[model samples]
Target: PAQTFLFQGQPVVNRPLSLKDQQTFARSVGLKWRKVGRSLQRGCRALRDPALDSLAYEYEREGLYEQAFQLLRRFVQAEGRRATLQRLVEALEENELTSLAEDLLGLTDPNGGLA
Candidate 1:
């Protein structure tokens, strides 16, 4: 349980993402961060979702939400896989929410963010 790393005499870690942990963390980033309502609903189309203003609002924020949600939460839970977070961080980056990635990683603090 002792997962820690050094950042060139600074800070680092090598935490592994579990098969179930992947999707669980996925949920936190998408919605658990607060204003991810659009993130969850807007990211996926196979589910039939929502939109923006004056049209063409450029949905980078919305576009990058659900896939990571579905990929992690829905996929691995039932259709499970390996227990390594090697690419889970990459997955968050792919969605443009690296903050969430480090979230579980604690690259950011949870207690301070929490009420």
Candidate 2:
């Protein structure tokens, strides 16, 4: 019951990833989000040892995407902040989470996120 509409005169939405409005999608696709986070952890392996995945799964199951990102923030606090956002986004894309993969990259630096 949020705000969403087909792209003007089009049959599909390009990408509706509103952390604010994904509530509907959150519950709809959320069952898989936990699983998605599992995959994300697999991708995140490029960074740390591993354990953030468990917390992300727990938080995502309890709350929503933002909660999962809480663990992500913790991740950035370590290697992420130092390692570089570019690498993380690439890892995500490599894992095929393109929905969220470079989306955040676009958020950070919208230009040339695809390149």
Candidate 3:
């Protein structure tokens, strides 16, 4: 059976979120502090054309691997972004954070590999 989802008598399940909706959703979720910081860094990257991307790598050079991983994960939303994030994770040698990155970005198995 085909089930239709409706809000206000209209189907909007496939609609894209507006900026206000995005903000609301972001606020409703409980993300890690470092994750939020990296999200800010990524917003800055959008303004600076990936300049902040380099800055994130520099954080790794200074032994702030978690920050670097978070920043990279925060800025990525495209397909290739995953590969780029993976490369940075490898370079930073932050395996656990890399996995955390994947989870935070919703790139991991939703059932946690059990289902």
Candidate 4:
């Protein structure tokens, strides 16, 4: 599996990342300041999924709505999904990313230029 890096709360690279670097990257990606320490202690392999989710949430929280939406767009497409926007909207909403969900609605709609 490939390693990833987070810079300024966003995934900036996908390559070899050290365990120490993983902890630092996890902190930058918004692992909840309080939880990052425990999260990192759990081992590098355990951090991947949570880190991915956190990166997504960081994008949403930062109001980088299009980037958040596009990241999920690519993930779902790679999984051969249908109705990805609807699912992405639900994921955002579930994560309390309401503003991002709404923005995504506008961006993915037929009249929103995605057509």
Per-prediction TM-score, please? 0.38, 0.40, 0.22, 0.31
lDDT of 2 by residue, 25-74 (tens): 24333335445445445545642334655566557566765564554454
Least well predicted 10-residue stretch by lDDT in candidate 1: 47-56
lDDT of each: 0.43, 0.43, 0.37, 0.37
Structure candidate 2, residue pairs in collision? none
- Give one digit per residue, the lDDT tens place, for model 4 in 1-115: 2243332244433422233332332323242332332333233343346555655566656644333333333343343323233433334444444444344333325455331
> Global CA lDDT of candidate 2, please?
0.43
Ranking of all predicted structures according to lDDT, beginning with the best and ending with the worst: 1, 2, 4, 3
**Clashes in model 1: which pairs?**
7-11, 17-85, 23-72
Evaluated at residue 56, the lDDT of candidate 4 is: 57
Clashes of each: 3, 0, 0, 0
lDDT of 2 at 68: 47
Against the true structure, candidate 4 reaches a TM-score of: 0.31
Off by over 4 Å in 4: 1-74, 107-115
Q: Write the per-residue lDDT of candidate 1 for residues 1-115, one digit (tens) a residue.
A: 2255442253555554564455456456543322332343333332223332211134335543444454444323432333234345544555666566566555667666641
Best by TM-score: 2
The pairs that clash in candidate 4 are: none
Q: For candidate 3, lDDT tens digit of each residue in 19-108? A: 332333233323332444444444334424364555455564554444434343444433232323223322222323434333333445
Q: Which ten residues in a row have the lowest lDDT in candidate 2?
A: 1-10
